[PDB]
Every structure is written in structure tokens, then in C-alpha cells.
Nucleic acid binder design. Sequence first.
DNA 1: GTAGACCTGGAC
DNA 2: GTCCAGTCTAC
Length: 259
Amino acid sequence: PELPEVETIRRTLLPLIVGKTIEDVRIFWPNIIRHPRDSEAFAARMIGQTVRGLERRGKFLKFLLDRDALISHLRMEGRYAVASALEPLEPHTHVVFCFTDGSELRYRDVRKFGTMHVYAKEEADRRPPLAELGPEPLSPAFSPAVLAERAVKTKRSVKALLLDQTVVAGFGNIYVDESLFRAGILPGRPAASLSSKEIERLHEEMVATIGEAVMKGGSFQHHLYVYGRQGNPCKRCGTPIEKTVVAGRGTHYCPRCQR
DNA sequence: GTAGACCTGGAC
DNA sequence: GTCCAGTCTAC
Ligand SMILES: [Zn+2]
């Protein structure tokens, strides 16, 4: 999931857990726990704390408790669900938070790529992994000036630049490909080759795409122009969409609309 | 920048 | 059987 999907999770999960107190924490795949390194310490410190809020920073979810904050990244396939602690768990459930009212928050992740870090609230934003993140795209903090500053400094592809969470936080493979198509820019061109006009246009489309995706509850799949449409005609010019590899990942684009 | 890592299951 | 699907690492 990318920013739109994570934001949809944040909004829907909050009312299902706010106000509940943690009674136990069970871990079935220790590698997911990154800090504290010892999973026994990770579990023990959360017992007795109550959920007070849930925020999002980039692609991360930030569970706010009493003293601590739990920072969770779903990576490629992580997912959360709330259910009765009396029922059998679903396959691939690796971490479970048991509440005093008999319900529980379950974390599932088939590929086991997700991560979890716990810090005191005041230290969360000053320690990894949140410390080095770029600005939120839907905030005044993200502007053309900010994009140009990083752009006019590197020769790597513009797609590689957009996937860099230190530049701006929240974009993944789908929304980077969609934003570049809407702005009319080829994904493989050097970031330093973009003109000032191209930068302003890219910024504008990035904000519009991510904003619209949030409103639609994420993949919005019926509104995709290029992602996963290789071999199909472009919705704007009819030219077949193509797929290659850029920045080490699948890349979709229209050879006529993007230059 | 270009494959491999970490891991598992679906489509061809 | 073989290719495909968010970050970090080593040549
Ligand atoms: Zn086109």
C-alpha cells in the first residue's frame, strides 16, 4: 500500500481501537520487531497502555498510546483487522495485540516484510525510521521549489527521485507512474533535465493524483491511465501502453503522451 | 544504476 | 517450472 491506501486504513481502523487497553502482545515472527530488538521487551512495555490515537506519516502508521508510539510499516502486503480473541486466527498472522475487553488487533503479512518500532512519543520523530522522511505531499511544506532543489542536483532518473522517501513522503510504484503520465514526462529521463515549467506541472499533478486517490479510498483503479495497462490503448491518444524497467522496478508509460 | 535479499503464493 | 509483486546492501 502507498499513501492513499495507508490513509484509508488509518481512518477506518481508529474508531475500532480507540479507548481500548492492551492486556497482552503475542509475536509469532520476531524478525518483524525492530526496536527494541528483544521481542520480549517490545511486548512487556506495551501491556497496560491505552490507545489514544492513530496518525500517518508517509507510508507509516503511528499508533499513539499512553507513553509510547508504535511505528508500523506494511511494506508490500501487511494488513490489520480487529476481531474476537475467541475465534481461530487467519493464516499468516504474525503479531497480535489483545485488549482487556476480549477483542484484538491482528497483523497479517504473507511475505513477512513489515516492520515495527516502539519509542517514547517525544523521541519517535527524532529517531529512525521517521527522522529522515521528506515532507507530506498534501501540505504547504511540499512545493515546486522543494522538488527543484533535489531535482537540479542529481542525474538519476526522475522516477528514482520520486520514489525516494527523503525527497517527498508517500509515493510508490503506482502513483509515481500515474503522476508522471499526467504531467507528460518520461520516467527514465534525468531529473536534472527537467525544465522549471515541467517541475511546476509535475508538482501540480502529484498533488492532484494523491489527493484524488485518498478521496476514492485508494486502489481509484478504475481511474488508472498506465499502471498495469501494458498492451492496452492509451485513454488519451490510443497508443499502446508500454512496460519496461526503471529504477529497478516495473514501469508503465505512453510513448506519445510522455516526453 | 543493476541483480540479489527478505518471503510467499498466484498467473501463465 | 519460471516470471511478477517496499527498502536495504554490496560490486
Ligand atoms: Zn497517450
